Symmetry: C2
Subunit: 164 residues, 2 copies
């Protein structure tokens, strides 16, 4: 309840803008991660992580759009485009895992044309461990296994997106 | 009508050590079981095999193996066809990346003391000859393409558990 997250670019239940849409697969978006600002950090938090996941992608496993772990416990915000794949806007110490598009960084929305809106779960994790062993080869599931094993609390924002 | 059998695995039966991962504290043989399918449906132009555990505690289950572009003339995968060096893969087939991070079969490795996990070994009859998959294709990406080209599927679901005591 106390552990919360907000953004200046996205909000729960509201259609994503073009800026956070993937560039590829017929989708021609900005492919930029929205900013995230958390609050209410749980006592004893040793690191944060952010994951973005679409449960509605018709794959059998959803779709992992972004994973970033090992954000220091002293940093309580991520700026716009912190998920860029060259890593120039990551907080010092943080590392990006591999998304389902096949690269380490943020990949925006790209739902099937004509589908009902997909839910993009942006989640900030408060973790009981300073560091987990992830690199640019870590699948979304491997990251999620480790985050679930060290979770204290999670905060989420769930924008939606559909292609008219 | 589309069906699959195996000499090494069976629905609801405990996996033997041959099919348990080698890594993450698991000390198995990490070998894929054989699979033989039949009842191939009219329209089939290739086959695919996937291995998925929905009970893995990750938020997206766990992709243990993906193999696609199995020529429409083959109805069998031999034991160890999923070795990552590709030495036992049928010609033409390609393996996608599993959640362990490699292109090849990775066996079971559930948390100690957990409820038994159900490993879905599934064969797919597809309406297309080739789908663009490579060693970097994630399990979701492969899954996206198989569901879009599916004619029929058959599956076997063995289980595996590691007691703490």
């Amino acid at each position: 309840a106390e552990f919360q997250v907000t953004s200046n670019e996205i909000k729960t239940g509201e259609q994503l803008t073009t800026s956070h849409v993937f560039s590829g697969f017929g989708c021609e978006g900005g492919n930029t991660s929205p900013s995230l600002t958390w609050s209410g950090v749980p006592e004893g938090t040793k690191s944060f992580a952010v994951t973005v996941y679409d449960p509605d992608a018709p794959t059998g496993s959803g779709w992992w759009h972004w994973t970033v772990v090992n954000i220091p416990a002293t940093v309580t915000y991520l700026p716009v485009d912190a998920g860029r794949r060259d890593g120039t806007k990551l907080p010092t110490g943080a590392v990006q895992g591999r998304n389902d598009f096949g690269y380490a960084g943020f990949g925006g929305a790209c739902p099937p044309k004509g589908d009902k809106p997909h839910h993009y779960q942006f989640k900030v994790w408060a973790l009981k461990t300073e560091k987990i062993p992830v690199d640019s080869n870590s699948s979304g599931a491997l990251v999620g296994y480790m985050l679930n094993a060290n979770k204290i609390a999670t905060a989420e924002i769930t924008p939606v997106y559909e292609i008219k």
